[PDB]
């Protein structure tokens, strides 16, 4: 491309005035409940997009059942719709999509987004929502008996171990009961730790940073294939890291990555990388923030939170992506940043920015954006932009899908 020098080339000049009490009124009240007039627009655009999406999937690859770009992804969207809208046509649609995604298993990856973890974990909860334990319990055992498959697997989101964790947490979250024994989550989380300190020695960070992780011959900073993603998961009460192991091991590793940030506030794609232009959830501030906020939650130190703000100001400035409107690397996925901040801070400035990003999404296709490689997919495509819009309806429950927790 021509746009290789800096963030500003990748992005659109943000045209929206920044928050004040007055402008927020149009979007939400002092309770941060969205004006029905606004929910109405969001919700009309959702119905409108869903039509195009549904027509689009007719020509989508029958072969791909990934969360990331295939049917299981769409199943995910619909289960989230059936939740936000009660409309049982969504639970039907979801059923047809997990049906489809279960003919796509290749037994060759273990993550929610790119491997059999997606179709299985999603089919599990769907079959549950349909009062149908026969298959619910059947998918469970196949999700579990996935473990022994890539024993030398990586650690990150898309192919790594946290990616398989999420699939398990997703099931448990959606049953409420602990259907996957805690010990089985503990199994895998152990080996991700012991392997992150080994790597850290062999390479000699273990002084500068007790833990280290890599994938595809790089140390990945960000959320998709990276440290930020992996640490975020380790600071996660659901994983249960010893209060000591949390301070001894993970805290300084985290701090190492913080130290990594560009002057701009952004974060390098890769360790040693010094091209400052990716504002994606997959690479940069918009994915790094989840770690920062989760760190402020558990260590309660003003620097973590002060970085999150710093993330957000960058995303606010450079998050409207020429890339398009998707979750992995697009305006929708970027907006989720703001919601996560907002849900911690409660500072209405952030719920506002999220809304103003939705304002952009509502002009889907009006900007010159290249259409995504898979135009209707959860993560590169329309299904994701839609996902956000629906999630935004009720901010406090908004979670970046297939990841956030
Ligand atoms: N397949 C994607 C294109 C992926 C592209 O946006 N690159 C992603 C890969 S996860 C990101 O790493 N961007 C790299 C860059 O912009 O240099 C689509 O067409 O929607
Ligand atoms: Zn990406």
**Token code pair at residue 186:** 């503990």
**Token code pair at residue 127:** 């079959």
Q: Closest ligand to 324 CA?
A: 1
Ligand 1 atom closest to the CA of 330, numbered from 1: 6
Query: Rounded to the nearest whole angstrom, what is the distance from the C-alpha of residue 329 to the centroid of ligand 1?
Result: 7
282 known member of a binding site: yes
φ/ψ (deg, to 5) at 321: -90, 125
Query: How was this one solved?
Result: X-ray
Residue with tokens 């000049």: 13
Widest distance between CA atoms in the chain? 58
Q: What resolution in angstroms does the PDB record give?
A: 2.8
340 known member of a binding site: no
Site to substitute for ligand 1 among 70, 323, 369, most atoms within 8 A of C-beta:
323
φ/ψ (deg, to 5) at 177: -55, 150
Domain, as residue range, for 209: 1-405
Q: For residue 260, give Cα distances in angstroms to 52, 218, 264.
A: 41, 15, 11
**Token code pair at residue 3:** 């746009």
Q: Is 307 in the pocket of ligand 1 (CB under 6 A)?
A: no
Which residues fall within 8 angstroms of residue 260, CB to CB, at 6 or more apart? Answer: 221, 267, 268, 271
Looking at the DSSP assignment, which residues form a beta bridge with residue 270?
220
273 known member of a binding site: no
Residue 128: closest CA among 77, 91, 78: 91
66 known member of a binding site: no
Which residues fall within 8 angstroms of residue 178, CB to CB, at 6 or more apart? Answer: 172
Ligand 1 atom closest to the CA of 224, numbered from 1: 10
Domain count, the chain: 1
Q: Are 199 and 214 in contact (CB under 8 A)?
A: yes
Query: Rounded to the nearest whole angstrom, what is the distance from the C-alpha of residue 295 to the centroid of ligand 1?
Result: 28
Q: Is 133 in the pocket of ligand 1 (CB under 6 A)?
A: no
Q: Is 323 in the pocket of ligand 1 (CB under 6 A)?
A: yes
Neighbouring CB atoms inside 10 A of 161's CB total 24
φ/ψ (deg, to 5) at 34: -75, 135
- Full 3-state SS string of the chain: CCCCCCHHHHECCCCCCCCCHHHHCCCECCCCCECHHHHHHHHHHHHHHHHHHHHHHHHCCCCCCCCCCCHHHHHHHHHHHHHHHCCHHHHHHHHHHHHHHCCCCCCCCCCCCCCCHHHHHHHHHHHHHCCCHHHHHHHHHHHHCCCCCCCCCCCCCCCCCHHHHHHHHHHHHHHCCCCCCHHHHHHHHHHHHHHHHHHHHHCCCCCCCCCCCCECCECECCCCCCHHHHHHHHCCCCCCCCHHHHHHHHHHHHHHHHCCCCCCCCCCCECCCCCCCCCCCCCCHHHHHHHHHHHHHHHCCHHHHHHHHHHHHHHHHHCCECCCCCCCCCHHHHHHHHHHHHHHHCCHHHHHHHHHHHHHHCCCCCCCCCCCCCCCCCCCCHHHHHHHHHHHCCHHHCCCCCCCC
258 known member of a binding site: no
Q: Is 3 in the pocket of ligand 1 (CB under 6 A)?
A: no
Looking at the DSSP assignment, which residues form a beta bridge with residue 200?
none
Neighbouring CB atoms inside 10 A of 345's CB total 17
* CA pair distance 250, 376, nearest whole angstrom: 37
CATH number, domain of 21, equals 1.50.10.10
Q: Is 283 in the pocket of ligand 1 (CB under 6 A)?
A: yes
What is the b/e burial string over 248-274, where b = at least 16 CB atoms within 10 angstroms of the residue's CB?
Answer: ebbbebbbbbbebbbebbbbbbbbebe
């Amino acid at each position: 491309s021509m746009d290789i020098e800096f963030m500003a080339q990748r992005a659109f000049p943000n045209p929206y005035a920044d928050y004040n009490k007055s402008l927020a009124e149009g979007y939400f009240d002092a309770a941060g409940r969205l004006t029905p007039e606004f929910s109405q627009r969001l919700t009309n655009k959702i119905r409108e997009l869903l039509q195009q999406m549904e027509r689009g999937l007719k020509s989508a690859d029958p072969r791909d059942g990934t969360g990331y770009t295939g049917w299981a992804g769409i199943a995910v969207l619909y289960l989230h719709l059936y939740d936000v809208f009660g409309d049982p046509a969504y639970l039907q649609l979801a059923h047809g999509y997990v049906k489809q995604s279960l003919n796509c298993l290749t037994k060759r990856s273990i993550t929610f987004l790119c491997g059999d973890a997606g179709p299985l974990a999603v089919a599990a909860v769907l079959y549950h929502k349909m009062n149908n334990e026969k298959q619910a319990e059947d998918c469970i055992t196949r999700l579990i008996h996935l473990n022994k498959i890539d024993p030398h697997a990586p650690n990150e989101m898309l192919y790594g171990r946290i990616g398989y964790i999420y699939a398990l947490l997703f099931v448990n979250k959606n049953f409420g009961v602990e259907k996957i024994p805690q010990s089985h989550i503990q199994q895998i989380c152990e080996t991700i730790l012991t392997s992150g300190e080994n790597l850290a020695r062999k390479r000699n960070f273990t002084a500068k940073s007790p833990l280290m992780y890599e994938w595809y011959q790089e140390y990945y900073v960000g959320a998709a294939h990276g440290l930020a993603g992996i640490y975020y998961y380790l600071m996660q009460p659901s994983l249960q890291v010893s209060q000591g192991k949390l301070h001894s091991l993970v805290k300084p590793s985290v701090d190492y990555v913080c130290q990594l940030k560009f002057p701009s506030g952004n974060y390098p794609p890769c360790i040693g990388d010094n091209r400052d232009l990716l504002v994606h959830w997959c690479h940069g501030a918009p994915g790094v923030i989840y770690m920062l906020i989760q760190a402020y939650k558990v260590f309660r130190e003003e620097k973590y939170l002060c970085d999150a703000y710093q993330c957000a100001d960058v995303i606010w400035q450079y998050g409207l992506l020429k890339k398009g409107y998707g979750l992995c690397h697009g305006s929708a996925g970027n907006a989720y940043a703001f919601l996560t901040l907002y849900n911690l801070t409660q500072d209405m400035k952030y719920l506002y920015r999220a809304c103003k990003f939705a304002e952009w999404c509502l002009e889907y296709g009006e900007h010159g954006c290249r259409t995504p490689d898979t135009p209707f997919s959860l993560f590169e495509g329309m299904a994701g932009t839609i996902y956000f819009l629906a999630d935004l309806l009720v901010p406090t429950k908004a979670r970046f899908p297939a990841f956030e927790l």
